[PDB]
Structure 1
Amino acid sequence: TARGTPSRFLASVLHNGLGRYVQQLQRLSFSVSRDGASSRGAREFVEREVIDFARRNPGVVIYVNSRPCCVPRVVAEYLNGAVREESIHCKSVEEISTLVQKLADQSGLDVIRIRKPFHTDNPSIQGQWHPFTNKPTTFRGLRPREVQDP
């Protein structure tokens, strides 16, 4: 629940998109297996999809390591120092491609509750409301029940 989990506000890394857009994904590391039956989808993805993804994302370093492992894995590292590890155990090539695209599109910020669906550093233009905003003024600034020039 919200009370049992952390929370944050909507934000971005170095105002991404204000001047230019920088892909926050930096590194993808795949650990796959050669003979493991649970790595068939990972092997197919490495065979026929990873090259196209690398072409489409020149700014992401992709490492592939074929080592004995029961659970094939993918690790995503983003420019802000965040590291996310996901499992591709018994996932088809389409599912792996969708997961990789989702990781590429994600900004790297922690996936937790966001308090507000909007963010702004200049909330007001005409002036934030204060109790004297709509109140008029009095000649010589006399308070109620005050006698002028005593």
Structure 2
Amino acid sequence: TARGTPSRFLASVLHNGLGRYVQQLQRLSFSVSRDGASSRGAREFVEREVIDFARRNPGVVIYVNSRPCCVPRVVAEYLNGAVREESIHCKSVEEISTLVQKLADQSGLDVIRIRKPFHTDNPSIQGQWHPFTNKPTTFRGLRPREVQ
């Protein structure tokens, strides 16, 4: 729940949308097994859909280790420093591909509650409401029950 989970505000690292959309994904590290059903899907991906993916996004720099791994993992390292580490355990190829795509797309920040689906640097253009907006000035700056 929201009370238990640590919260967050909406932002975008280093102002991506302003100038240039920068791929936040640096590295995908593929731990795969040569032998083992654990990583059949992973193996398949390595064989066929990884090269294409790499070609598509050259900002990402993929590593593939083939390290007699009992459970295969794909470590996604991002530009801020955060490391999203996820398993590839007994997944179909398509699913794996989808996961990879998702990893690529998203920013470096935590997958936690966001608080407001919006975030303006400069909200007010006319002026923020003080109580003295929509209040008339009196002559000589006078107030209730005064002398002169």
Runs of 4+ aligned structure 1 residues displaced above 6 Å come to none
Deviation (angstroms), 1:67: 1.2
1-structure distance, mates of 2:108, 2:33: 27
Deviation (angstroms), 1:13: 1.1
Deviation (angstroms), 1:107: 0.4
Deviation (angstroms), 1:38: 1.2
1-structure distance, mates of 2:19, 2:38: 44
Deviation (angstroms), 1:132: 0.2
How many equivalent pairs are there? 148
1:32-87 Cα shifts (integer Å, max 9, x gaps): 00011111100000000000000001110100000111100000000000001000
Q: Pairwise CA RMSD of aligned residues?
A: 0.5
TM-score, normalised relative to structure 2? 0.99
* Residue ranges of structure 2 left out of the alignment (5+ in a row): none
Deviation (angstroms), 1:17: 1.4
1-structure distance, mates of 2:75, 2:53: 16
Structure 2 residue aligned with 1:52? 52
2-structure distance, mates of 1:22, 1:99: 20
Deviation (angstroms), 1:137: 0.4
1-structure distance, mates of 2:21, 2:38: 37
Deviation (angstroms), 1:134: 0.5
SS class of match (2:29): strand
2-structure distance, mates of 1:6, 1:37: 37
Structure 2 residue aligned with 1:129? 129
2-structure distance, mates of 1:49, 1:133: 61
